[PDB]
Amino acid sequence: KRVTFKDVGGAEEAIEELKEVVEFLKDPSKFNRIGARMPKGILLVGPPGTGKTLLARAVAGEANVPFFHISGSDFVGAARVRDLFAQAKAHAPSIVFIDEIDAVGREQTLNQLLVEMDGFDSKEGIIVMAATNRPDILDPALLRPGRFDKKIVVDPPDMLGRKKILEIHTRNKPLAEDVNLEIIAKRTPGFVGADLENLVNEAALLAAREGRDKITMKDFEEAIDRVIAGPARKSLLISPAEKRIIAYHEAGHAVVSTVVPNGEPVHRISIIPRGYKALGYTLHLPEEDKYLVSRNELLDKLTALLGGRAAEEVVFGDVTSGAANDIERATEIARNMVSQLGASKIDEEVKKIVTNSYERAKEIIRKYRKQLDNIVEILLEKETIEGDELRRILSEEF
Template sequence: MNRSKGYNSIFAFVVVLLLIVVFIEYGKGFISNNSGAYSTTSFAEDIKAGKVAYATIMPNAETPTGAVKVNFNDGTEEVTFYTTDVTVIEKLLTDNGIKHEVEDVPSDNILITGIIPVIVGLVVMVFIFTMFTNMQASGSGNNRMMNFGKSRARMSSSEDNKIRLDDVAGLKEEKEQLSEIIEFLKDPEKFTRVGARIPKGVLLEGAPGTGKTLLARAVAGEAGVPFFIISGSDFVEMFVGVGASRVRDLFAEAKKNAPCIIFIDEIDAVARRRGTGMGGGHDEREQTLNQMLVEMDGFGVNEGIIVMAATNRVDILDPAILRPGRFDRKITVTRPDIGEREAILKVHARNKPLADDVDLKTVAQTTAGFTGADLENLLNESAILAATSDRKFITQSDINSSFTKIGIGTEKHSKIVSDKEKKITAYHETGHAILMHVLPDVGPVHTISVIPTGLGAAGYTMPLPDKDDMFLSRNRMLEDIMVSLGGRIAEEIIFGDITTGASSDIRKATQEARSMVTKYGMSSNIGVINYDENEEDVFIGYDISHKKNHSELIAGEIDKEVKAIIDKCYAKAKEIILQYEDVLHSSAKLLVEKEKIGRKEFEELFEGKAISEEFELEI
C-alpha cells in the first residue's frame, strides 16, 4: 500500500513538470509580447518618423508567432520585438519603401526540445531513487554500496549441508579429535555440568588440498548446525575499519544462529604477525586482527560459537591468536598415506564407472605425496579422457595417462624427435631405471618412457613404492642422489659425451646433498649442527635483518662436504651401471622400439642376474 502511494506521488510529480514545460514553451511569446518595452505600435511610429533603416522578419522565431529585428538610421542599437502577425509588419514595410528581408527560422519541436529531455531525466532520477530505496530496504550483504561493512560470510543451514564425516576418507586421528566438538554442539549441557569448556577455536594446519575445508564442513554436517564460511581476504579492504566492521557483523550473525560454526579459510591473510614494522599500527589488516582477537575472547561458555580456521603457514600467524582461549586446539592435517589414498580414490570413484583392469591400490602406490584434491583431480582427468575417447567407463590406461599429464606433463606424441635424441634419452632413462631397480630403498620401476612431455622433459622414469616413508634414512638419501645421477652417468659411458638433459637431476642431487650436511647433520666432518638457511622460513619484516648463521670458513667446509657426497655417489652409481651394462643396452634398444615399457618388461631383462640386497656407502 505504501509503495503504491509512492508511485502515485512520483507520477503526479512527472505530470506537473510536463505541464510546466508546455506552459513555458507555448507561453513564451505571450509573455514576451506583453512585457517588452518595444512593440508593433512603437515600430509603426518609428517608420512614420523615418527612423527605421532596415528590418529583418523572422517567422516562427522563438515562439509560434514571429519576431522582427529593426535597424535604425541614427546607428542606435538594433531592437527585436515579437509579433502575432508577421504579414502586417511585412505590408507596413513595403508600403513605406523600407528595405527588409524575410529570414525563415523553422519552429522548434516542443516534443524534442522540451518534453523528451525532461522525461528522460525524470526516468533516470526515478530509477536511481528506486534502486537506493530497494537496497536500503533489503539490507542484504551483497549490496556492497549500502552494506560495505557487512560480513560476506556465506551461511549453510543444517538442511543444506549434506557432508558427513563418512564422506571424508582417511584422516582417522583428525576426525577423532573433532568428535568432541561435534558432541558438544549436539549436547553442550553434558560438558557444562562438569565445568568443562569446549575449545573456542580449532586451527586446521596442513598442505593445500589435504581436506581442511571438507573436515570443517563435515563437522557442521554431523552436528546439524549452521555453517558460516568466509575467506580471510574477504575481511580486508583498502579502507581502514571496514574489516573490523565485517568481523563484528559476522560474530553478531553467528550469535543469532548459535550453536554454529564459523570457518575462516586462509586465515593467514588477515592474522599475520603484528609488529613487523610494515603498515604501522593503523594498518587495515592489524585493525581487523585486533577486532577478531576481541570477538574470539568475548563470548562465554554457553554461546555455542566455535571458530574453525585453516592455514598452511601457521608459522607466520600472530601469537595472540594462537593462545589458549582463542585457538585452543591445533590439528595438523597431513597428506594421506597409501591406505588413505586408496580410500580417498574409492570415495571419488563412487559415481565413475571403472573398467575391470583398474586397480586403485596400484594407483595409490604411484601417487605418493598426492593430497585428496590431487586424487580427485586425477580421477576427474581420467573421466574426461574416457569421455573424449567415446567410452562409458574409465580404464587403467586413462588413469596412467592422467597421472603423467598431472605430474610430468602431457605426452607429446606428435613432437618430432631425431633417432639420435631418442637413443640418448633411452640410455639416460635406463640409467635411472637400473639404479632404481638395483638399490634396495628406491624402487621398483613402474614405467620408463622416451616420449617428450609438456613440461619439457625428453622422457621419464616412474617408480612404484610399496610404502610411504615417515622419514628418510641417510642411506635412502644417498640412493636418491645416485638415482638422480644415473642418467648423466649412462650418457657418459655410452657416448663419451654429456648433454644438458641432466640439469634438473643435478639440481635435485645437489639440494639433497646440501640438506644432508646443513639440515640433517649427516656429515661427520660438519657435525650435528643446523646450518640451513631456507629463505621460506624468514618472515619478511619480522626477520628482515637476517644474517648468516655460520662463518665463511664453515661455508667452505659445507661446500667441500657437498662435493664429497656427490663425487662418491657418482662413482658408486657408475660402478653399478657398468656392472649391468648389458641391461643398459637391451633396455635402451627396447625403448627406442616401443617408446614406453612397464615394470614386467624391464625386470625380465635382469633374469639370471644376482641383485645385492645390501648397500652401504661411506661418506
Template sequence: MDKKNNKNNNNFFDKNPLLLFIVFAVLIVIVFRSIAPNGINELNNLTSNKQVQVYTYSDIKNLAKEGKLAYVAIGQKIVRAKLKDGEVITVQKVPNDSTLVEILDKYKVPYGAINDNNWLSELIFGWIIPIFIFFAIWMFLASRMQKGMGGVLGIGSAKGLIKSEKPDVKFDDVAGNDEAKEEVKEIVDFLKNPDRYIDLGAKIPKGVLLVGPPGTGKTLLAKAVAGEADVPFFAVSGSSFIEMFVGVGAARVRDLFNQAKKEAPSIIFIDEIDAIGKSRAAGGPMGGNDEREQTLNQLLAEMDGFDSNEPVIVLAATNRPEVLDPALLRPGRFDRQVLVDKPDFKGRVEILKVHIKKIKAGKDVDLEEIARMTAGLAGADLANIVNEAALLAGRKNKKEVNQEDFVEAVERQIAGLEKKSRRLNDKDKKIVAYHESGHAVIAEVTEKARKVKKVSIVPRGLAALGYTLNMPEEDKYLMQKSELIAEVDTLLGGRAAEEVFLGEISTGAGNDLERATDIVRAMVSMYGMTDVAGLMVLEKQTNRFLGGFAQQREYSEKTQEEVDKFIKEFLENRYKHVKETLKKYSPVIEAMVKDLFEKEVIDGSRVRELIKAYEEGRLEEVINNSSNEKNNEAKEENNDEKNGNNS
C-alpha cells in the same frame, strides 16, 4: 495464523525492496492526484452541485449582456461566474482577451480577480514527490550497497557477503584423514549436546586451527563438522576482511560474530586465515598494515568475548602456520591445532574409493596400483585424477573408465598434458631417447633409488620433451643420506648419457641439475650430512608444507665458499660415477633407445628385463626374441588385412 501471514509478507518485501518502493510511490501519486484539482472547480465549488448545462467563455459574455450575472471572478486561466439564481459556473479563459472586462463594465456587472494557481498541488507535485522519489531511490541503493559490500562504499557490514548454510557433507565423505576426524569429533558432540559438557564444568575449545598442505581437505573437513552437527556454517575467506578503508575488516568481523551468535549453535570457518592473522611483529617497530592489524585485533577481541560455554566454534585453515600471530594461537583462542596432512597409501586408497563412486569404473581398475603411483599427492590431486580419467574415457567414447585411463590421468597430473602435436625431429628425438634412457638405467641399477614405472619420449607439459616416471615402492617420510645420493645420481643420469653416447650435451638437463644442486645444498646446510658445516644448520626451511628456504644468511663468507666448493666437487664426483656406470651398461642404453624410437613409450618392466638379461649375458637373445615377436605380429596384421580385402 495472522502472525504467520505477516511474517511471510515482511519476508516478501524484504526480499523485494524495489517492488515495495514502487507500490508506495504509486499510492502516494494516486492519493494526491485524487485531491488535486482537475481544473479547479471541484476544489473551490461554492455551494451548489447543480449544473443544468455546459457553458463556454462566450456564454459568460452573453449572460453579462442579458443581466443574469451576479458576480464574475477572473483568473489567469479560468473565469468563474455566479448567476443571480445562485448557480456557479467555471469556464476556461481565452488567453489575452480584454473584451470581457469591457462588457462587464458596460453592463455594470461586479467582477474581481482570483488566484487560480493551486499552491498545494504545486508544492506536492513540484517538490514533495520528486524529493521523496529521489530519497527513496538513494535509500534503496544504499541498502543494496550495504548488503553487497558492507555498507555505502563497502564500509561496515558482512550481511550479504557472509551467509550461513547447512552443508550436507558428512565424515564418510572425508577419507584419508582419520586422525584429523577423531580430533574434531568432540566438537560435533559438543554442538549436539552442549549441556553434557557444561554440567561437568568442561570448557570446549573456542577455536580449532586446521593446518596442512594445499589440497588436503581442510575446508571439506570443516564442512563435515557442520554437516555432522547439523548447525549453521558461516564460511569466509581471510581476504574478505581486507579492504581499502581502515576499519572495514574490523566491522565485518563484528558483524560475522554477531550473526553466528544469533544462530547459535553454529560454526564460523575462516579459510586462509594467514591473510589477516600474520604476526604483527612482521611490520617492524613501526607496525604493519593498519587495516590488517585492526582486523586481527578485532578477531582477537571477538574470540575473547565468547562465553566459555557459548555454542559457537571458530574453525580456521592455513598452510602457513609459522606466520600467524602468537596471540592468535594461545589457549583461549585457537586452543587446538589439527594436522591435515597428505594421505598415506591406505588413505589414498580410501580417497579414491570415495571419488570413484561418482563414475562408471571398469572391473580392471586397480585402486591400490593407482595409489602406489600417486605417492605424495594430496586429496585434491586424487579427485582431479579420477575426474581426468573419466574425461579421457569420454573422449574415447567408452562406456566405462578403465585402468589405462587412470594411468594416463596420473601421468597428466605428474608430467603434464601429452603434446602429440609437438613432434620431434630425428635429432632431438635421439637426444631425448638417450637422456631418458640414462635416467632409467641409473634408477634401476642404483641401490635405494626409486624404481622406474615408465619411460617416454612423447613431449608433455610446457617444456618436458620426454620423461621417466619413477615411483617409490612404499610411502617414505624420512630419507637417508644414501637415498638422497641415489636421487642425485638418477638426476645426473640424463646429462651423463648425452655426453657418453652423443659426445655433446644439450640444454635438456637444466632442471635436473637444479634439483640435484638443491638436494646437495640441503644435505650440507640443513641436514648435517657432511663435514663442511658439521651439525651447524646454515639455512632454515620456511614452510614444511610449501617448501622453500630462508634467504637470510647467518654465516661467514668463508663458510659460504666452503659450501660452494663442496657442492661443486660432490656433484662432479657423482657425475663421474654415473658416467662410468652408463658405460658399463651401454648395450642396455642402446637397446632402450631402439625401443623408444620404435614405440616412443616403454614400461619399467622392459627396462628391468633388459638390465637383467645383460647381467646374465643373454641380452642379444632377448632383443632378438622381441624382434621376432614384433615380426610375427606384423605378419598377422598383414594377413588380417588380406583376409579382410578378400572378403
C-alpha cells in the same frame, strides 16, 4: 553441497580429534555438568590440497548446525568481522570458520578479531576454527591462552589412503570389470586428494570422447601421462630413480639411531612424510624437549640428525634439500650447547662440534652397509614398515 565424514579418506587421527568437537556441538550440557572447559579456537595446518576446508565442512555436517565462514584472501574489514560473530550468537550452537587466516593475521582487522574472541561465552556451544599452510608467520598474539591454542596436523596420504580416496570419487560412475583401483594407487606416489580428484575426471573425458558408456583400465593409465607433462600439467609424482635416493635417506636416520646408546626408538619408516617436524614446521615450540641437559645425550642427538646426509655422500656422493635443512638445524643446537655447558672464538667452537659429529655418522654407515642395503630393498616394495614387522626386522638385523 553437504558432506560428512564418509567423504574423507586417510585422515583417521584428525577425525578422532574432531569427534570431541562433534560431541560437544551436539549437547553442551553434558560437558557443562561436570565442569569440562572446551578450547575457544582450533587451528588446522597442512600442505595445500590435503583437505582442511573439507574437514571443516564435514564437521558441521555430522552435527547439523549453522555454518558461518569468511575467507582471508578477500581482505570495512573490521565491520565484516563484527557481523560474522553477531550471527553466530543469535544461533548459539554454531561454528565460525576463518579460512586462510595468515592472509590477515590491516592492523585494525586483527584488533577487532581479538576483541570478538574475548567477548563470547563458550558454554552455549560456540567454536571458532581456522586453517593455514604457513603457520610460522602467524602473529604471536593469536596463540596466547584463551585464543587459538589447539593444533591439528593434516598429512599427505599413503598407499592405502590413496585407494580409499579413489573409491569415494568413483561410486557414482560406471566402471568396467578390468579396472583395478589398487594397481592405480601403487602408481601415484606423491599425489594428494586434490590431484586424485582431477585424475578421475580426466579418465571420464577419454571415454566420453569415443561415445563409450564405461571407463576401462587403459583410460586410467592414459590419464596419468596427461596430467604430469605438457603445456597444461597439474601434478607431480615420484619416479623410480628418485625413489631410491629417498629410501636411502630415510634408512640412514633409523640405522644411526639404533646404534648410538642414547638414541630414540624407531617405530615407523616410510617414503611419505607424516609428522609436523617432517613437514618443516616449528609451531612456535622450544627445540629442547627434555627436563635435563647433558652432554652425552646432546651429542647422540646431533649424530642421528646427520644420518640421512651421511648416507647420501657415502653411497651416491650427492646432497639434497632435505640434507641441507638437517645441517641448518644442527648448527642451532650446537650454538645453544656452547652457551650452556661451557665472538670469533665461539664460532670456531661451534664449527668444531658439527664437523666431529658428521665424521662419527659416516663411519657408522660404512660399518653397517650390509644392514642398510637390506632395509632399502624391503622399503622399495611395500613403501612403509611399522608395527610388529618393523620390530622383528630390526631384531633379525643388528
